Amino acid sequence: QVQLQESGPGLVKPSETLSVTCIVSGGSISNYYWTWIRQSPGKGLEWIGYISDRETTTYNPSLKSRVVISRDTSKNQLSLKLNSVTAADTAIYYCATARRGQRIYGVVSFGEFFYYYYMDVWGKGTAVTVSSASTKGPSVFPLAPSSKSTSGGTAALGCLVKDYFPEPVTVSWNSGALTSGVHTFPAVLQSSGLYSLSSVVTVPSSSLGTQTYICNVNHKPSNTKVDKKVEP
Amino acid sequence: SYVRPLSVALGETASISCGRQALGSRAVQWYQHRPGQAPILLIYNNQDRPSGIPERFSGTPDINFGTRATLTISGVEAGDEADYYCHMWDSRSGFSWSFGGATRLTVLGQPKAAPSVTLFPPSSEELQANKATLVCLISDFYPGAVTVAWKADSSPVKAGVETTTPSKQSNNKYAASSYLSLTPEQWKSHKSYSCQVTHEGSTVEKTVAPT
Q1: CATH code assigned at B25
Q2: Is the CB of residue A14 less than 8 Å from the CB of residue A128?
Q3: What CA–CA distance (Å, rounded) separates B141 from A208?
Q4: Residue A160 and residue B27: Cβ atoms within 8 Å?
Q5: Angle subtended at Cα A23 by Cα A8 and Cα A25, rounded to the nearest 5 degrees
Q6: B46 and B145 share a domain?
Q7: Are residues B75 and B121 in the same domain?
Q8: Helix (H, G, I), strand (E, B) or coil at A153
Q9: Contacts of B41 in chain A (CB under 8 A)
Q10: Do B126 and B193 belong together in one domain?
Q11: Which end of chain A is more exposed for a tag (fewer CB within 10 A), N or C?
């Protein structure tokens, strides 16, 4: 039952080194082949390279000479470093466990066979933006509910997250307590080049005066955590 | 481009073919990726199917001399929209570092849904900052093409307006948002501001006013 969680800088300056970390929980690192995959907006999933259970690594000739993949048993985590990055390197980076399969079309002796690799388990991935520009924390403003009345005991209540770079921002309500009515919208990229988004939950009208609603905003790159309370 | 679009009507069975056919013995893997989320392994070893993967997805085994590699989805749903990658390993090509081309599956015939629109005026905290932004939230609509227009009073505003391209939600309906950036004095300068969104010939218009 391996669970994979990625971690990254969020922003990398051009010509600097990109480093991401995959946190493995509930299974030993040693038991699996491990690999890294990146996806870029204008490009398809790209295979960076893989590392065996024996610590043997094979890299993509395209990314060869810029990449290192390493394993840390003590922290039970995997690593991926990318030297001398450029905007071509802006992508979402995934780590995944890998399985090796052998298909023999002939006789194993005489080497009439070939290996193939496929990835059963994937991490959520981490977003990395390569830019000259500095990271900017977002400013959080509450979106007050109308108050009564709509003839249905629902009102729209949210938080506005403004002018942050780069992506992404994670928003939760009541410390993950309330999930039912929440809708967090995709961000918008402004002329400035900063991003903004909003998270909105639908709640009863009657509760609004006495109920507690707090939006928890996480921006790891900035790295900014802001909790803002919303009131009518 | 890396993308091959393919459109299929709802409830129909999709047929997807890997970009390059094998020369010999083969081991084909199918990956389903929705941009923004993690890829998933639909099929491995030609026909083998991981647990938690529905029966609807199937692959062609390469029995006998040969078989063409195709992915079949029976009774396609809206949630099956996504990019499909065929990972092909054969005995005459060697290590395949490329996942190859992506087949973008678009599902059609989904019923029309009117958008729900919510408009938020500038908050008191923002005004204190000498910034004003109006937030218009559009959700639960199909198809994904919407026209958003902002008015100050009865007159249109095109300045300081930022709108996202609509994208699919978890429920398979589209969501989008528009932002009108105003100085606080400008916000106070008008009796009202309106968010006019037009979807499939009809219009849903919301209005806020300085209080």
Answers
A1: 2.60.40.10
A2: no
A3: 28
A4: no
A5: 160
A6: no
A7: no
A8: coil
A9: 118-120
A10: yes
A11: N
Task: Indicate yes or no: CB of B125 within 8 angstroms of CB of A158.
Answer: no
Asked how this structure was determined, the answer is: X-ray
Contacts of A116 in chain B (CB under 8 A): 27, 29, 89, 96
For residue A101, the chain B residues in CB contact (below 8 A) are 27, 44-45
**Do B13 and B105 belong together in one domain?**
yes
3-state SS, residue A175: helix
User: In b/e form, how buried is each residue of A175-210, taking b as 16+ CB within 10 angstroms?
Assistant: eeebeeebbbbbbbebeeebbbbbbbbbbebeebee
Q: Resolution in Å, one decimal, please.
A: 2.4
- Residues B73, B173: one domain? no
Nearest to B99 among A44, A105, A198 (CB): A44
Domain span at B135: 110-211
Whether residues B87 and A118 touch (CB distance < 8 A) is answered with yes
Nearest to A124 among B38, B99, B176 (CB): B38
SS (H, E, C) chain B: CCEEEEEEECCCCEEEECCCCCCCCEEEEEEEECCCCCCEEEEECCCECCCCCCCCEEECCCCCCCCCCEEEECCCCHHHCEEEEEEEEECCCCCCCECCCEEEEEEECCCCECCEEEEECCCHHHHHCCCEEEEEEEEEEECCCCEEEEEECCEEECCCEEECCCEECCCCCEEEEEEEEECHHHHHCCCCEEEEEEECCEEEEEEECCC
Task: Tell me the fold of A1-132.
Answer: Immunoglobulin-like (2.60.40)
- Cβ pair B35:A116 closer than 8 A: no
- Asked if domains A1-132 and A133-232 share a fold, the reply is yes
Write out the CATH class of domain A133-232: mainly beta
Fill in the DSSP letter of residue A136: B
Contacts of B98 in chain A (CB under 8 A): 47
Report the side by side order of strands in the sheet with A224-229: A170-173, A214-219, A224-229
Distance (Å) of CA B141 to CA A129, B120, B163, B197: 31, 19, 16, 11
What is the signed CA dihedral for B17, B20, B25, B26, rounded to 10 degrees?
-60
In the numeric block, which tokens belong to residue A199?
């998270």
Q: Cβ(A17)–Cβ(A5) under 8 Å?
A: no
